[PDB]
Amino acid sequence: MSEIIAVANQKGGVGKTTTAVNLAASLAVHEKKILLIDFAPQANATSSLGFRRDKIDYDIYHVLIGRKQISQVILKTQMPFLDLVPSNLGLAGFEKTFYDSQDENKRGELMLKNALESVVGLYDYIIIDSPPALGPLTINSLSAAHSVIIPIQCEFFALEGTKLLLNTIRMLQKSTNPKLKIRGFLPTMHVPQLNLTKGVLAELFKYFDSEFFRDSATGEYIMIPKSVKLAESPSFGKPILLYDIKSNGSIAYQKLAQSILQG
Amino acid sequence: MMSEIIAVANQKGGVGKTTTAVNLAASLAVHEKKILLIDFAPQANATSSLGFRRDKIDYDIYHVLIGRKQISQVILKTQMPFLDLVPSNLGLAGFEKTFYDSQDENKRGELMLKNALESVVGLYDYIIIDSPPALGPLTINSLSAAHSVIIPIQCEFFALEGTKLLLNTIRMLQKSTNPKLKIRGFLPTMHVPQLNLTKGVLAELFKYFDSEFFRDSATGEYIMIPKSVKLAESPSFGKPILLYDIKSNGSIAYQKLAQSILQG
Ligand SMILES: Nc1ncnc2c1ncn2[C@@H]1O[C@H](COP(=O)(O)OP(=O)(O)OP(=O)(O)O)[C@@H](O)[C@H]1O
Ligand SMILES: Nc1ncnc2c1ncn2[C@@H]1O[C@H](COP(=O)(O)OP(=O)(O)OP(=O)(O)O)[C@@H](O)[C@H]1O
Ligand SMILES: [Mg+2]
Ligand SMILES: [Mg+2]
């Protein structure tokens, strides 16, 4: 039975896709069976794994509207234990479908959850990459999930942003997903010596210190460092472990996976 | 006054749309041009960048769009006399539902921002719109209202696939709802010239798009916003960078950007 993990932040460019891709790969290297769901219309996760937009046939949007079952759209990747549900531009049509269903039921929030029900016994982990909004796509991600990883870029808008995302999660924990947990807060693109980084982290630590990911071996906080090689990796269509497994970016995501595998 | 309405748009997240909208607006304001900044994103980062608390704001752009308030009822004065703000709130996430209601009955909704701006176009020299990271109803409304669009581009790998897709949306709107819409220009942001990935991405962008890039007409140079510690720090003080550090490289770059706009 899958643990379904959403990677969510409504702030743009905070490392959601990079985290979802590289965590899924770092778990798959252990020969745990992993499904990555690209839940964003811009489809950066799909492209990160080497799949160009013009080569995608049927995608997650076709599953949500019922043209395809989810087993029909699953792609195998270069890693034998990592599978991908690709996305495409057509997933921007989901918003229309969501509000239409809310005139035919109350159930639009559960459309991804219902789509995943035939694969939950086939994978150890299902990782969902969310778009930068609190709209219907992210609401579907969080309603399908057992847990949520929040990548945090520590710059100024993270302060107001983290508080809002947590309020969204609390409201879902009342209504549509009572079992939903914060898996953890993960600092991404992290540059420890910056004063802005220090100020933002200190503020988040006051309220949130128990939510930050820690190394299961050393007890240290797990943070993903700003890394030239991490930014280069989707241009090769590979997660960073498949080529440079000794870079600091690769080592950090591997620490994250080890922390997830403990439970 | 006849406003030039400029949208700042990219569906990629975190590429500097808000930083560009706020700092271009301030850089135009110091030339005694009357500027209206519209925060068109539900996350409301432009509102926070100018020193306002989102939770303290009663009525915003969402209420204007659905017709509950006139735009002149929600306009706030900022610290700079020539720069006014229409704030945003999380309630702007409700607009999508309103849009798809309007598309269902009369097939409208693209023009809701344009219609809302009609009473202020004679009152401002420039109206700058900060868009959210999506190609949805809010970005469709900002591009349908605009004379021109500035596309901030972070030059990392997803810029290549993403730029073409935004251009497609722009072309489709140029055929239907907004024929006058032009690209004002592509603006490289968070730019670190020495990186191999930066060089590779820019070479490919110049290959397809060279004529679209912002230029300093005095030197012929490409205008790029450098990665700057101070640019990231400035919204934490509720100031644009020219009020925070006017001599910093990011300040100098946004003033060059404003010169390019002002020269025509
Ligand atoms: N640790 C890191 N070091 C350096 N660059 C990074 C790191 N993490 C991500 N990046 C780069 O930063 C950019 C933004 O990251 P990414 O696209 O993963 O964020 P996102 O939150 O998924 O964005 P969006 O909101 O558009 O979905 C990408 O170009 C990526 O290659
Ligand atoms: N040239 C720069 N140098 C350093 N930091 C920058 C620069 N431009 C923007 N930033 C910082 O990078 C982050 C992303 O910028 P910003 O929020 O303006 O992007 P955006 O495209 O509006 O994001 P979103 O997609 O979330 O709306 C912000 O924290 C900002 O303070
Ligand atoms: Mg992403
Ligand atoms: Mg923004």
Residue numbers in the entry:
A (entry chain B): 2 to 264
B (entry chain A): 1 to 264
Which lines from the publication concern this structure?
The ParABS system, composed of ParA (an ATPase), ParB (a DNA binding protein), and parS (a centromere-like DNA), regulates bacterial chromosome partition. In Helicobacter pylori, ParA and ParB homologs are encoded as HpSoj and HpSpo0J (HpParA and HpParB), respectively. ParA forms as a dimer in the ATP-bound state that can bind to nsDNA through a continuous basic binding patch formed by arginine/lysine residues. The partition complex interacts with the nucleoid-bound ParA forming the nucleoprotein ParA–ParB–DNA complex, known as the nucleoid–adaptor complex (NAC).
A key residue, aspartic acid (D41 in HpParA), coordinates the water nucleophile (WNu) and initiates ATP hydrolysis, playing a significant role in ParA ATP-hydrolysis. To investigate the relationship between WNu and ATP hydrolysis, we solved the crystal structure of HpParAD41A in complex with ATP, HpParAD41A-ATP. The overall structure of the HpParAD41A is similar to that of the HpParA, with a root mean square deviation (r.m.s.d.) of 0.4 Å (in Cα). In the ATP binding pocket, the electron density map of the γ-phosphate of ATP clearly revealed a complete and unhydrolyzed ATP molecule. We can clearly observe the WNu located and coordinated between the γ-phosphate and Asp41 in the wild type, while the WNu cannot be observed in the HpParAD41A-ATP. This suggests that Asp41 likely captures the essential WNu and plays a crucial role in initiating ATP hydrolysis. As a result, HpParAD41A exhibits reduced ATP hydrolysis activity and functions as a deficient mutant in ATP hydrolysis. HpParAD41A is an ATP hydrolysis deficient mutant with lower ATP hydrolysis (0.4 ± 0.2 mol Pi released/mole HpParAD41A·hour−1) compared to HpParA wild type (1.0 ± 0.3 moles Pi released/mole HpParA·hour−1). We observed that HpParAD41A has a tendency to prolong the ATP-bound state when in dimer form.
